[PDB]
């Protein structure tokens with residue numbers, strides 16, 4: 163059904179998913195000159211020491227690395243959040259060229275890609291129930307710019323040939339998502355939505371100010387993935403990002419400046 167092409171891309175999603183035209187859609191442009199420093203926001207607590215990665219999956223829209231979320235292992239807390247949010251997966255959005263690919267923008271700047279670490283609020287007991295609640299999910303967004311390689315990303319890049327096409331998975335154990343973080347945990351935060359269907363308004367977004375650097379070779383390997391399944395016409399998995407949506411009444415808060 164939905165995807166990222168001319169015929170099924172972001173401009174069409176509202177017909178199956180009317181909340182696409184809602185009041186709290188994501189991503190947004192982060193206007194750094196209107197974001198409000200909030201001295202009461204806490205440092206983020208990213209606690210990934212016990213993370214247990216299990217698998218990597220090409221889901222036809224992105225690839226995702228999934229974790230064991232059946233115990234409090236890898237959790238996000240603090241910052242703007244009230245409870246504890248458990249990591250379930252991360253995935254990326256990227257472009258066909260280094261000058262596009264991120265979902266969020268910063269003063270209209272697009273990055274080459276964006277990493278989303280998806281966490282669910284443990285007060286809701288499971289990820290699927292959390293997806294139905296206004297404060298169900300917290301997604302940590304990290305921009306990727308092209309420059310030096312990110313060594314912590316290479317284990318991911320090297321397995322992508324084994325999941326070229328939609329529906330392929332591979333075991334992916336012992337991956338440490340701490341290797342994908344920038345030095346600083348300074349962030350912006352605002353209330354929003356999933357950026358892909360069903361576009362539910364269930365996300366507290368936490369977008370880090372500092373991008374990570376990845377090499378041109380690393381991002382090129384993302385662009386060799388396919389949206390299609392095996393045996394179908396080849397369609398390169400590129401430009402799997404939703405453009406910025408109207409901010410509406412919302413305020414973006416900053417943890418710094």
Ligand SMILES: CCOc1ccc2nc(S(N)(=O)=O)sc2c1
Pocket residue numbers: 278280293301355356357358359360361365
């Ligand atoms: C069953 C889980 O379903 C979904 C659907 C859409 C979706 N979008 C995001 S994002 N790009 O991080 O805002 S995470 C997510 C999970």
Ligand SMILES: [Zn+2]
Pocket residue numbers: 253254255278357
């Ligand atoms: Zn995403």
